[PDB]
Paper text:
Hemagglutinin (HA) is an IVA surface protein that allows the virus to attach to host cell receptors and enter the cell. HA is a homotrimeric glycoprotein, with each monomer composed of two regions: (1) the head, comprising the receptor binding domain (RBD) which is crucial in viral attachment, and (2) the stalk, that is responsible for viral and cell membrane fusion in the endosome.
Comparing the structure of A/Denver/57 HA in complex with C05 Fab to our six other HA structures showed differences in the C05 antibody binding site. Finally, for Ser240, the most notable amino acid change was in A/Almatu/32/1998, which harboured a Pro at this position. The antibody C05 Fab failed to bind many of our other IVA HAs, as examined by analytical size exclusion chromatography. Our other IVA HA structures all contain an insertion near the C05 Fab CDR3 binding site that appears to prevent antibody binding, via either insertion of an Asn which becomes glycosylated to physically block C05 binding, or insertion of an Arg, Lys, or Ile into the C05 binding pocket. Although the insertion of either a glycosylated residue observed in the electron density of our structures (A/Netherlands/002P1/1951 and A/Fort Monmouth/1/1947) or of a bulky side chain which partially changes the loop conformation (A/Jiangsu/ALSI/2011, A/Almaty/32/1998, A/Hickox/JY2/1940, and A/Melbourne/1/1946) appears consistent with the loss of C05 antibody Fab binding by analytical SEC, rigorous mutational analysis and quantitative binding experiments would be required to prove these are evasion mechanisms. Interestingly, these insertions do not affect the identity or the positioning of the sialic acid binding residues, allowing these strains to bind the cell surface receptors while eliminating nearby potential antibody recognition sites.
Numbering used by the authors:
A (entry chain C): 2 to 325, 330 to 491
B (entry chain A): 2 to 325, 330 to 359, 362 to 495
C (entry chain B): 3 to 325, 330 to 359, 363 to 491
Amino acid sequence: SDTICIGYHANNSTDTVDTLLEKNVTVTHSVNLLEDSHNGKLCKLKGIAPLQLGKCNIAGWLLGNPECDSLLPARSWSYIVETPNSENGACYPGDFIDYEELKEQLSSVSSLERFEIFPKESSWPNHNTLKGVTASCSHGGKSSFYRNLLWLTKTGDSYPKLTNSYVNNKGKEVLVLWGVHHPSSSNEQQSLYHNVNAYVSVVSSNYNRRFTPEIAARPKVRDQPGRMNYYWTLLEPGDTIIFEATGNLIAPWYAFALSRGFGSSIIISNASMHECNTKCQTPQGAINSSLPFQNIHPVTIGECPKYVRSTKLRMVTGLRNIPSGLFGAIAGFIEGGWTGMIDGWYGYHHQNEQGSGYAADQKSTQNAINGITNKVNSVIEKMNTQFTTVGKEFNNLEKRMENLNKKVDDGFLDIWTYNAELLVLLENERTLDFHDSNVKNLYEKVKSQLKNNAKEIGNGCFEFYHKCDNECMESVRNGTYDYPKY
Amino acid sequence: SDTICIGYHANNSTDTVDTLLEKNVTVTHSVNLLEDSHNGKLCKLKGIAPLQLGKCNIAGWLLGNPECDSLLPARSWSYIVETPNSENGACYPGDFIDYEELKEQLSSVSSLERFEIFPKESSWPNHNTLKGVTASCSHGGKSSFYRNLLWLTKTGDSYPKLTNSYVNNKGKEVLVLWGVHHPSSSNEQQSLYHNVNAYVSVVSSNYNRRFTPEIAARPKVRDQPGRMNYYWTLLEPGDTIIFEATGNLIAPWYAFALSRGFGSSIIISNASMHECNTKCQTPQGAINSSLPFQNIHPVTIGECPKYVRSTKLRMVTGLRNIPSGLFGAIAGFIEGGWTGMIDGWYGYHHQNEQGYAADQKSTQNAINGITNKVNSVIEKMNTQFTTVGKEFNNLEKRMENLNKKVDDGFLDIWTYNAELLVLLENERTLDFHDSNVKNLYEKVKSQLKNNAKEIGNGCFEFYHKCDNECMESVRNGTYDYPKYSEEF
Amino acid sequence: DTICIGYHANNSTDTVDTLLEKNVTVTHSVNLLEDSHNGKLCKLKGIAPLQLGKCNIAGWLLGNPECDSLLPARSWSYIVETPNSENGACYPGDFIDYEELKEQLSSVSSLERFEIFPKESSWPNHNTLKGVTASCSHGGKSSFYRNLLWLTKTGDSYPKLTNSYVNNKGKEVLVLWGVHHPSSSNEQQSLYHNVNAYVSVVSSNYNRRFTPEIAARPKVRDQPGRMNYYWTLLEPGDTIIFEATGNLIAPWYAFALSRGFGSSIIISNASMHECNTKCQTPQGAINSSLPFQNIHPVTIGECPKYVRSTKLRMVTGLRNIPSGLFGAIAGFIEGGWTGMIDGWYGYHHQNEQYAADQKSTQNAINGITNKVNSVIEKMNTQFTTVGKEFNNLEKRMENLNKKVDDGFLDIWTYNAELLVLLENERTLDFHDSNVKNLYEKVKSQLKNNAKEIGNGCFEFYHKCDNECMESVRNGTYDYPKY
Ligand SMILES: *[C@@H]1O[C@H](CO)[C@@H](O[C@@H]2O[C@H](CO)[C@@H](O)[C@H](O)[C@H]2NC(C)=O)[C@H](O)[C@H]1NC(C)=O
Ligand SMILES: *[C@@H]1O[C@H](CO)[C@@H](O)[C@H](O)[C@H]1NC(C)=O
Ligand SMILES: *[C@@H]1O[C@H](CO)[C@@H](O)[C@H](O)[C@H]1NC(C)=O
Ligand SMILES: *[C@@H]1O[C@H](CO)[C@@H](O)[C@H](O)[C@H]1NC(C)=O
Ligand SMILES: *[C@@H]1O[C@H](CO)[C@@H](O)[C@H](O)[C@H]1NC(C)=O
Ligand SMILES: *[C@@H]1O[C@H](CO)[C@@H](O)[C@H](O)[C@H]1NC(C)=O
Ligand SMILES: *[C@@H]1O[C@H](CO)[C@@H](O)[C@H](O)[C@H]1NC(C)=O
Ligand SMILES: *[C@@H]1O[C@H](CO)[C@@H](O)[C@H](O)[C@H]1NC(C)=O
Ligand SMILES: *[C@@H]1O[C@H](CO)[C@@H](O)[C@H](O)[C@H]1NC(C)=O
Ligand SMILES: *[C@@H]1O[C@H](CO)[C@@H](O)[C@H](O)[C@H]1NC(C)=O
Ligand SMILES: *[C@@H]1O[C@H](CO)[C@@H](O)[C@H](O)[C@H]1NC(C)=O
Ligand SMILES: *[C@@H]1O[C@H](CO)[C@@H](O)[C@H](O)[C@H]1NC(C)=O
């Protein structure tokens, strides 16, 4: 007798997916949604190299610590890289006021131009510009000083009241940095500045601060009992800044005209720079991927997959792999799949006097391929790209804000890890049920064509009561079986 | 010859919904969950108009910038509106310390009583109350000053140490504002206050601050090289505030007894006030809606739909529209729907010698389930109540960016939640109808058994004569099979 | 003469909800929401909390004389303030960065209180004896903090003092001090002689100078003076130098800190008991393995996730129908069998001479067990929540913190409730599908050899004994014999 059987695809795949109902289900086709590979290097971003501070931190760079001269030509960058445990910062000990806020400002700067805000040789005619070096800021085995600040002291035995103004005609914000020095004794105050009770005043149209030396016994920091506090402000285009002092001013020498940009950040990384280009950079390495998720690093620059805690995110696209359910066909009354059917997901096996063969049902297969492809793309589309994450740093009196920031990051990460894993589990179950349903619907369509002209053999097969040649088989496969003829 | 067919509804609906598997599925019935329409106007909230500061900001209002006099009678409001056109704040240049914190405080204030904390004519017998006007704060082309502060100066080249106390007897918090003036020269310091080295002290039971004038050369802001810094504190009921000064005090004259309320806020909007009432206000306009979501504005006042970024949220309630699946019936062996069946979702078409009719039982059970599902989804989407604005000064960029990460993160999640739930439930709803049609076909097929031929297209060809009385029996579920096995 | 396929029923009154239906009575279900606690404060992993009682953190660390019972405190698992702690900074003034100090103590597992500047010998040129006050009274006498020392002039001299402490404790040392602000210049001279005094406090990373601000002030607890309190964490090996010409309320005792994990500060009016717990809330301890709880958002230890839900119940069994998407349950098989006590799906036979289908039932049990376990696994336990407090000039931060907490709580309450509703619908459909598949297997195995009644039963044309009935149940039915 001649027979036609309805069955489904199988292959040599060893891909496994999970559902809520079952773990480690081997499937014929699947897609990985989780990027876990990077190149372990620092790369250019959209063709623009980062700024590598190397042995310096942000403080050492912007103040011009003399160990940081290699950073002086710095113009434009795609992101800024601090290395772990930068050893060159504010060499002369003291407090850098609103330092974290300054770093947050630099996080949106794409370029700056360093310029001589107060030319050293001409700006300070009544004061000494030459004696301001210190062993606290040594370089090349000699006492030195910041490149961007100027330690003014008395000339002869006079420190007259100074007043210096700068008008911002750069057409951009100007970052102005200065310092206030705090001697360790009144005699030192007089030796450096003559005036016993001095002050510094710095005023713009939106900045206004006055500083008084606070002289006291202090522990030595790198053998220095003095202190030098550092301050900064953003001078708006067209605005004027006025410095007034009777002592203790560490005057601006160079300042920075800032250009604002999009998508920059400051990261800490021990990775090395290479001649690579990427659209996505993390502190551990660059990512070249189109997947929706990644488990490499929560800190990203550019356009990156969303970070999740997951170790596996795999969506099934094909069928259970059974090479010899909710709808009962796959792994049900059709107990196994057909490795012999290599051209579709669902199809037919026939056996007549002319021979036998496998043929996939193109219509049901292509409709299932279209649905599953839309499902995967729809899932990916809902997982919007992760753009440059903004670093957040807090000082030792901002622990509450630090913990709040951590709670926010941790909470969002919890939710997206849960969303990603759960959606994949649910959709994997639905995808397997979808295939089971398609096999079931295909079987029932063939059963409705043949009616009493064949007996059901139980395994998805029909044993014809007449002879069914290759032309007759094709009629069943394309759905035009002429029942009255037999 | 006589036939009865099982089928499903179709109509002229052009509504489309999406699923994970398919996009733009035309369906017979659906509900929009996303509000995108507003009236473009500012309205009253629960019958109470907002406070429109107009050309003034909060500082100009509370300090009493003379250009803001129309705001002085202000008593109660439902929300506060700043416009992008704020030209009137602190007319005399200076810093307003903790301004953002003050605005945050005002956001929960439903009414204030402006009152004379230190009557000008009696509080300061030893100082000059008349010389304290300035071109920086003009009104009507004449030099003036804040309506709520008093610029005390020396009288007869003397400025004695002043000490003035006020006991809060209002039974509410009292907001007290004052200023400290910083001359641009010692000559000016002496011309105004005589004393070269003055101070201001302001102390309550929980506030304690001392101010020293800082004289220096400064750039002119609005033709003024001096500065005046503004300060405020909340004086608890029963507490006393004591002002002590030897110069430079811009003294409180009027203060504010504050009443706390719920659901108020401060917004920035250039929309206009109209004679309308709403339960939900945004800066772009008021919303009149019961839908769970809206894409009009993240800033809301009152009881509002949840803001999402989505541009379409549509839940299918009916069936795919097929006018002349997981279970194989709809778009399956029953290849199409019936536009002729206008009274239900699933039913029967007959053709005897003597017509569409809906099956009330299967249709009404599906109606209840779909109605329960949509309501359950909507109930899970809790209403959005008044959002609190967040403003930060130029040394709070980190906190500003944290607030933005918080707002963006929640917005991402709810947009994802809303869109995904609709896609998932749309697919299950379509499959639900497919199951229902399938189950009804099998029920009728189980009633008819061998008394009819199964045509395969959802139709049964009767082997006996089936009149309108026989057809009704099939729909009823009361088909008498043995009675017609003998009528072949 | 008959073989029937059917499903389990029992006397369970449990109800679950789906998106489609409310209050569906089901045969088996599992509560995921913990709502019971013991109403007591307990030990955490064997270690008792620090009960501040009538004192707040300030009164404890300053050594408010009403807080003497707290002086030997060494180690604890968490810290408990009670509502309306009436003993704090007895002498009125500002405690600078108080909330930050509390945040620091939230990760402290133990401290060692020690005499940083021995009273009788550290201040040879100043008076250590006159520093008591009615603001800090104890036992009906004027008194003072136990951890600070109110230095004053000796005779009529208050020379410049300089005192240093080197931190040799191998741990961070918490140092506290105060600055006194008299109400008049005469009081300044009576106490400290010097009219214009200052205090300086400097370590390697702290540097602050303080000037007395003398002014008319309202009396707080009959005291018009003020005393402001300051603190710093002195790193191991670092030195702190105090320098003063008056007004210094000197450190007397300081605290060597040991850092720990999972501690916190809570406010609770519950009482301590001789109980041990892995999860503590301010309302009581929790003894539970459930993923969610609605008792309190503030937790210590390893706790179920807090949600606002009032019911979270997952159906595991079937709809209970005693005497659907796939059409079997509550469909052509109109009801369940209370007689079938050994499985979810099975058969009832009736020959001349109940049994559950073990294979489908056990496959259903494994699937449902995996689904419930997978749900709980995705709901990560809630670890110790870190309290957040803000001063009266930090209202924006307080509201931002509240937006975060409320925002996360909304999302987790939504996620938990929705997942349960969705999976409840899928579980019922799962059982419906299984019964249908079992019915379809029996109908295809016995083929035309039995009458198909319509209630899931088949009427045999032949005699089918206990050996034959087992053939149908075992899937080994020999159709050719009939
Ligand atoms: C589901 O069952 C619960 C419990 O029987 C119902 O809750 C009752 O709701 C009414 C509302 O007016 C209250 O008066 C009762 O006190 C509630 N009972 C309990 C025990 O809380 C609920 O209404 C039912 N829901 C539906 C849709 O039928
Ligand atoms: C798996 O099957 C594919 C397709 O038949 C073949 O190309 C590949 O070599 C096979 N690999 C193994 C390991 O069997
Ligand atoms: C680089 O930094 C990472 C992150 O802290 C760290 O785990 C890793 O050990 C570092 N590598 C080296 C060589 O220090
Ligand atoms: C990423 O990998 C693909 C794989 O072919 C390659 O075409 C592409 O150039 C890669 N991108 C980068 C930036 O190297
Ligand atoms: C369908 O099968 C019949 C039978 O062989 C054949 O004649 C006809 O051309 C087929 N049509 C298509 C579109 O394959
Ligand atoms: C459908 O028909 C009704 C009745 O004529 C009409 O009001 C409605 O606009 C029609 N819809 C479309 C899309 O044509
Ligand atoms: C759906 O229809 C709209 C309008 O006809 C069209 O713009 C859109 O591209 C279609 N497809 C999707 C996926 O929205
Ligand atoms: C304010 O007006 C400008 C242009 O006049 C417009 O672009 C902006 O959207 C308006 N703001 C609001 C909140 O409607
Ligand atoms: C708001 O919508 C309702 C819809 O029922 C409508 O009746 C009402 O006229 C609309 N306007 C107001 C002000 O309620
Ligand atoms: C409910 O039925 C079970 C099954 O036998 C029985 O063990 C239990 O005692 C019954 N409980 C009640 C309250 O009827
Ligand atoms: C604890 O405080 C709550 C606050 O509402 C109160 O309801 C409860 O009675 C208090 N318990 C005790 C034991 O004081
Ligand atoms: C905690 O509950 C379990 C049962 O849920 C019980 O066996 C155990 O004894 C309980 N422990 C305590 C300390 O109450």
